[PDB]
Design an enzyme around this catalytic site. Structure first.
Site: not given
Ligand code: FAD
Ligand code: CDP
Ligand code: FES
Ligand code: FES
Ligand code: FES
Ligand code: FES
Lengths: 287, 797, 155, 50, 51, 156
Positions: B231, B379, B751
């Site tokens: 990522q 998160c 998110e």
């Protein structure tokens, strides 16, 4: 993921399969739908050096009627059980309950015979086979014998089946006109094994239970028939009190194993609840 | 017509279909395991069967003699290259291959290199390892006891780590934010007070595609090429170069199509290092692809926070202060993804959507015999914990005052006119309008009617089910960026975009981010489409190749739209400014006499006189106006001035079967406001997915360990993942409150659904037990656990 | 090693395979049909789902050697002369995919499910797609994709 | 050659390596992070070798 | 010509020209080496790919 | 009909089945991906396809693969040993004996054999001993210097 090396065999007859089992011994394993056997081999739980595939044997397939007995080939795939017009008319319980087994893809390979032969307390067919009073035809080097579903399950992964035998077909008496039935299965998600389950087959006569068969799934090392529970109903009026008594009698024989599905406390209580729901749903289906 | 031209662009605001779908729906995607290179060998890892113990001996001979096996490496082979340990984003060090001992079950002990994955698997079974089992540390509390075993024998004697002083050998750090003195004072004089303990269980992102890579060092050219599930490929390249000694320009890292990340693929796992080392040694390509059990057991986990929340208030419900203390379980090594200066991420965002005058929080990091991680599941760097805490506390305070849970929120909300709002922790919320969103949600579900149905059901002691209503009003903080405060291993958390217009009007664009299915190839193109009047369809975007793309920090924590989105707009705007300059020369007028209208510069007054972007592009390559260089392209690295603060208001109604403990979500309404929306269709998909992760975490996910430290339920056999049947129908709504500082006013949103949904489910489950005094119930809310609570509070059957 | 002949996507494939070779590895490693994916080792995810002799089967729990004389279809074989199959079009139009990892399996399942049940209800779709897991979509759009494909198949 | 040094004080210098890291670590105020450039050259005249 | 300096000091360079054996990958690197104080060995030049 | 043959290329056995008309050059390039050897003509003049067969320099474009069943073939991909460049490869590198590099693989294979036929060659002998290889870039000057370099390294 990676299964160990093994030799492959693909017999076209029960006899050849039985011969191979005798010739190769315990190092060989009958491969059916493969949805229990391969997963175990892929995790190195079981490492047979020989796999005897029985998917190319036509005599292990087909669903027919011989008198009042429904004959089901051991290699009958779960989905064929669901779509079978015979099973739907003569044994509605099996057709509906098979829908609660795994998922579509698994049901295209997993067979009723392998589900039973595996002898996993977590599987659905063991209890179901007891509620419907099925019988299993086993073929060995000496010939054929037929054993009852009720008495076939000896322990976790253990059945009356001998290492040189092949379950050929499952014979079950067609439901008599008006037979009530049910299969309540408490599960975490679709396609998962039951936390607790109860199979029921019953007949009615006035306000009383004229016939009763109760079986429990995944609440002991083997599927269980609950005779004491059956006795709480036979020849008695179907009342709330009798149903509660049956549950207690079923609860009394539970010996659940503790895992991520819950403890003995929960599984036992759920077995009772599923018994209560099963009996009620069965009575509702009686006529 | 001008409206038609804008529609033809398929840019900002349009729900255009995805550009990346073509290849995926035909099986032509290019994921790591799809790669095959000449001479490529396969690697597999020998893993520890125990959670803690010394390594007596490793037997390599049986595996080495096995036909197909080329090599069996251990930590001993890594020492010369100083690679048996590697640095982490948390400033700690993690073992690449266990040396003197194993710190957690499933830890990498040795590797094998074979012709394929089949032989490779056989080789792992042939490698025998002898151990001396040592006492295991599972509970964070037992870890701090004076007689607790020494996990990190490598840190012996040290009194300080990378995040301050250490008070115990298992103690990783202690971090705090806020005004402790002021908060302690408020609580001492507060008329109303509540304190609740809650565990946010350790769960795993479990992306469908596991981690893996194909490392390839070419001894002839002297350079390394690694295709990886990363990522953040650019920082990986920088790190790989540093540890290998291979100059950075000769190291090429490429993130191809990745089957989901969710923060799980942000770090560098030992498997990558070993593949690289093996490739360098053998002189040929080495492929490593972990199985599901390896992914769940050893890659980055999320949560695992033990929280003690406190709230001070007045009788009418106005919150006066917030005090929180936390114990964080980071596993054997601290490899928790985070900006260098925040060992607990942005947990200090726990003030929430409320104007709380005083507050303080303190997070204590602890080592245990478990796999590393902590931040890795939508998160946003501990925001999931911060939101869960504040929302849980507000409910507790609401119940104590016998005050409606929505009313107490509306009363404490930061008002629209207060933005930009500076919290007690120091964050400057960009914008918001919580009140309007709340009333919107309450109205759509007929909240009052819901409470009446609940009151009517509670009144009947025989009601076969319990009705629960959960409500969460949250504020997110995404776009990890300000280089002054945010940096990954010393690299400022900026991002970039290079756009190049071709002679004929189309374009190619590259960013420092890397999508994992969130749609950047579509959305990014839409941003540029509107900025330049070039249809999104011919603006080809690429990410992930460190050798072609501009340096960036990758994508996680919903930072893409905030950071890269800004760089894209700014780089585009640099091109638009030059284009205006070129259009002026062509039209023989001054720039100020021009008007941009969708896809052309037209002279003020006279409409017939104009020059399209196609016309301008050509001119740039034909003959540049005096003073300008030929070409039409730009680059931009954006160091964000602040984070982005999207908000949400989620409501969930549940019905609990009193006889079995089963919880059925009857309804879920999610309202999200992420400012300017690029593609409503793509936004809706992110919400659906995130809410689903929320349902999975709150209602089923967990990673239990037995007394001996063995991980239980680490496969799909028990690890909960909802199917189409368990997943409820999601209702979505929204409002638009643009980020003032952002070039296009867009905020991250991927998110938010995850962060907000989790506490919404618990709010609904607890609210169902509220009338009998229940204040909190720890996740997961599986039927087994809810029944356990049902029997405890006499509500079973 | 057993020599087999499997018809994959309409073409005969005579190959020598080890009995332990899982159909999924044969499809991906031998034929390079990398559309089908692997998401687990326990047979739950269904990202490896292919159509075998008229039925949806998870190729990670089937041996290649068992496909001797079988008819196998993968996602690479769904499109007809370049024209997308109804299911492929449905997932595209209804945004039924994100990372695209579970997509090939979903498409192969939906392709068969729609022949099993041409006019399914939402409940029937969700249940009929239970063997396939998705980490990105939340299933909602996948349901709409299947409904979209069903409408075009009866068009 | 490869560094920027302070006039009259050799001990105070910064190499291109130091500068490069600094470029990605913390860009000075008013400067974008990174250290790169592009140039399109339109020659004023040909070259005449002999 | 486009030059990108990496965090560690090395660099990648691409031009609109295309060598056919005249040594651009070496010479181009030498020009950049003298201009930036970065050794030519670690200045990787590339040409010929329109993307 | 394809003929089954096994050719030893760079010490490794290559079991293939090819039509008899298959030129060795295409067998090396197409069947084995040993694309070092090149094709520069159709009349056997250039030598860009030169490989070492059974101890002799041969233009693979004028030899059949089917005639190599059991032969020992050496290609440019096999000159280096354990990564260390053969004296001939080092010679062309140190002396700038290549530009586009198209004739290089052939020049190297030829130089490799020539240096065994004649360890201490004069300039005239080098130019003559390398006559079967054409080069469009170098002008041959640095090539003779390269061979002289390789010659010296082999004697020390
Ligand atoms: C994800 C998943 C979920 C599942 N969920 C459920 C569930 O909810 N409920 C459930 O009941 N099952 C479930 N199953 C199991 C499928 O129901 C078991 O597939 C099948 O139990 C074992 O049957 P099989 O036909 O696949 O045979 P195999 O996997 O081959 O196993 C057969 C076993 O019995 C022996 N055997 C097989 N056939 C014969 C025969 N004819 N004669 C003698 N011995 C024989 C074999 O040697 C072996 O020991 C699930 C499986 C999976 C992968
Ligand atoms: N305001 C917004 C924010 C995100 N999005 C889109 O949603 C997707 C996820 O965006 P994101 O910034 O929140 O997250 P990552 O893409 O960093 O995971 C990206 O394609 C988007 O451009 C949008 O259309 N509009
Ligand atoms: S790989 Fe998961 S079911 Fe096949
Ligand atoms: S789209 Fe990613 S798992 Fe389904
Ligand atoms: S190709 Fe010219 S001599 Fe062989
Ligand atoms: S270097 Fe070009 S032909 Fe010899």
């Amino acid at each position: 993921m990676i299964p160990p090396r093994f030799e492959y065999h693909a017999p076209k007859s029960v006899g050849e399969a039985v011969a191979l089992l005798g010739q190769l011994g315990s190092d060989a394993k009958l491969l059916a739908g493969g949805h229990s056997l391969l997963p175990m081999m892929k995790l190195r739980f079981a490492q047979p050096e020989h796999l005897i595939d029985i998917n190319r044997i036509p005599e292990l397939r087909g669903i027919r009627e011989e008198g009042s007995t429904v004959v089901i080939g051991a290699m009958t795939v779960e989905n064929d059980l669901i779509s079978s017009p015979i099973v739907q008319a003569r044994l509605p319980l099996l057709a509906e309950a098979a829908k609660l087994i795994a998922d579509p893809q698994v049901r295209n390979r997993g067979t009723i015979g392998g589900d039973i032969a595996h002898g996993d307390p977590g599987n659905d067919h063991p209890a179901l086979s007891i509620a419907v009073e099925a019988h299993f035809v086993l073929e060995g080097p000496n010939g054929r014998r037929t054993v009852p579903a009720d008495g076939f399950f000896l322990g976790t992964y253990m059945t009356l089946l001998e290492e040189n035998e092949v379950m050929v077909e499952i014979r079950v008496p067609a439901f008599a006109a008006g037979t009530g039935w049910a299969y309540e299965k408490l599960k975490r998600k679709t396609g998962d094994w039951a936390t607790a389950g109860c199979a029921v087959v019953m007949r009615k006569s006035g306000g009383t239970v004229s016939h009763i068969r109760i079986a429990l799934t995944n609440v002991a090392p083997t599927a269980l028939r609950a005779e004491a529970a059956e006795a709480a109903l036979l020849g008695k009026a179907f009342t709330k009190e009798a149903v509660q008594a049956a549950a207690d009698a079923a609860i009394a024989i539970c010996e659940p194993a503790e895992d991520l599905r819950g403890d003995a406390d929960y599984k036992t209580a759920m077995a009772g609840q599923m018994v209560k729901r099963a009996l009620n749903a069965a009575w509702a289906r009686c006529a | 017509d001008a409206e038609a031209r804008e529609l033809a662009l398929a840019g900002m605001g349009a729900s255009r279909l995805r550009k990346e779908d073509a290849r995926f729906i035909q099986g032509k995607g290019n994921y790591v395991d799809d790669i095959k290179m000449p001479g490529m060998l396969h690697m597999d890892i020998v893993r520890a069967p125990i959670a803690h113990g010394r390594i007596k001996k490793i037997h390599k001979d049986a595996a080495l003699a096995m036909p197909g096996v080329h090599a069996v490496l251990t930590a001993e082979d890594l020492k010369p290259l100083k690679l048996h340990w590697m640095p982490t984003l948390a400033g700690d060090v993690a073992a690449v291959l266990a040396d003197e001992k194993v710190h957690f079950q499933m830890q990498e002990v040795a590797i094998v290199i074979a012709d394929d994955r089949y032989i490779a698997a056989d080789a792992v079974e042939a490698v025998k390892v002898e151990y001396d089992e040592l006492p295991v540390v599972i509970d964070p509390i037992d870890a701090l006891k004076p007689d607790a075993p020494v996990l990190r024998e490598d840190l012996a004697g040290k009194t300080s780590g990378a995040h301050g002083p250490r008070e115990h050998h298992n103690h990783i750090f202690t971090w705090g934010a806020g005004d402790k003195a002021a908060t302690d004072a408020v609580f001492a004089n507060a008329p109303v007070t509540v304190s609740q303990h809650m565990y946010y269980p350790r769960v795993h992102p479990c992306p469908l595609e596991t981690c893996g890579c194909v490392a390839s060092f070419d001894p002839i050219k002297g350079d390394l090429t690694t295709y990886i599930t990363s990522q953040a490929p650019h920082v990986v390249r920088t790190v790989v170069s540093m540890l290998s000694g291979i100059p950075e320009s000769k190291v090429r890292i490429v993130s191809p199509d990745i089957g989901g990340g969710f923060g799980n693929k942000v770090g560098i796992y030992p498997g990558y290092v070993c593949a690289i080392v093996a490739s360098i040694v053998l002189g040929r390509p080495v492929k490593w692809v972990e199985d599901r059990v390896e992914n769940i057991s050893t890659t980055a986990f999320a949560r695992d926070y033990h929280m003690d929340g406190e709230l001070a208030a007045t009788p009418d419900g106005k919150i006066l202060g917030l005090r929180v203390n936390v114990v964080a379980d980071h596993g054997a090594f601290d490899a928790c993804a985070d900006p260098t200066k925040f060992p607990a991420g942005l947990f200090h965002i726990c003030s929430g959507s409320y104007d709380i005058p005083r507050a303080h929080c303190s997070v204590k990091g602890v080592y245990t015999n478990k796999a590393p991680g902590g931040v890795a599941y939508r998160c946003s760097f501990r925001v999931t914990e911060a939101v869960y805490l504040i929302e849980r506390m507000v409910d507790v305070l609401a119940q104590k005052l016998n005050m409606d849970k929505a009313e107490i929120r509306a009363k404490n909300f930061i008002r629209k006119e207060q933005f930009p709002y500076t919290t007690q922790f120091g964050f400057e919320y960009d914008s918001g309008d919580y009140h309007t969103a709340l009333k919107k949600v309450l109205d759509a579900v007929d909240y009052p009617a819901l409470r009446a149905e609940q009151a009517a059901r509670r009144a009947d002691p025989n009601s076969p089910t319990l009705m629960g209503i959960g409500l969460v009003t949250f504020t997110e903080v995404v776009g990890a960026g300000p280089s002054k405060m945010c940096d990954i291993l010393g690299v400022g958390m900026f991002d970039s975009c290079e756009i190049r217009i071709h002679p004929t009007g189309s374009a190619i664009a590259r960013m420092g981010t890397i999508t994992q299915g969130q749609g950047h190839q579509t959305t990014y193109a839409q941003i540029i489409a509107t900025e330049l009047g070039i249809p999104s369809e011919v603006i080809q975007v690429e990410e992930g190749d460190t050798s072609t793309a501009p340096y960036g920090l990758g994508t996680y924590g919903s930072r893409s739209t905030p950071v890269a989105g800004a760089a894209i707009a700014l780089a585009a705007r640099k091109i638009h400014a030059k284009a205006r300059k070129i259009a002026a020369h062509m039209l023989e007028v001054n720039e100020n006499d021009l008007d941009w209208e969708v896809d052309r510069f037209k002279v003020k007054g006279d409409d017939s006189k104009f020059k399209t972007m196609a016309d301008i592009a050509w001119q740039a390559y034909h003959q540049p106006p005096a003073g300008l260089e030929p070409g039409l392209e730009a680059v931009h690295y954006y160091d964000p001035p602040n984070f982005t603060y999207p908000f949400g208001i989620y409501l969930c109604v549940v019905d609990i079967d009193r006889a079995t403990g089963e919880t059925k979500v009857r309804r879920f309404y999610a309202l999200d406001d992420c400012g300017t929306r690029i593609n409503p269709m793509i936004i809706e998909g992110q919400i659906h997915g995130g809410l689903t992760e929320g349902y999975a975490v709150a209602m089923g996910q967990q990673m239990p360990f037995d007394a001996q430290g063995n991980l239980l339920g680490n496969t799909l056999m028990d690890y909960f993942l909802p199917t189409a049947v368990e997943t409820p129908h999601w209702e979505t709504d929204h409002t638009v409150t643009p980020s003032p500082h952002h070039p296009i006013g867009a905020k991250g949103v991927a998110e938010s659904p995850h962060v907000g949904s989790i506490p919404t489910f618990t709010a609904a489950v607890v609210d169902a037990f509220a009338h009998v005094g229940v204040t909190h119930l720890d996740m997961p809310h599986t039927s087994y656990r809810v029944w356990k609570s049902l029997k405890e509070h006499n509500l079973a059957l | 090693k057993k020599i087999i002949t499997v018809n994959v996507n309409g073409k005969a494939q005579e190959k020598a395979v080890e009995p332990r070779t899982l159909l999924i590895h044969f499809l991906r490693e031998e034929l390079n049909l990398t559309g089908a994916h692997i998401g687990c080792e326990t047979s739950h995810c269904g990202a490896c789902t292919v159509d075998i002799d008229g039925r949806s089967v998870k190729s990670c729990t089937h041996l290649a050697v068992q496909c001797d004389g079988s008819e196998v279809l993968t996602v690479e074989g769904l499109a007809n002369k370049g024209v997308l199959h109804a299911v492929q079009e449905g997932f595209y139009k209804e945004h039924g995919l994100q990372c695209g990892f579970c997509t090939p399996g979903m498409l192969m399942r939906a392709y068969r499910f729609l022949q099993e049940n041409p006019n399914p209800t939402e409940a029937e779709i969700r249940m009929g797609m239970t063997g396939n897991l998705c980490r990105c979509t939340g299933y909602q759009n996948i349901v709409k994709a299947v409904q979209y494909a069903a409408r075009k198949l009866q068009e």
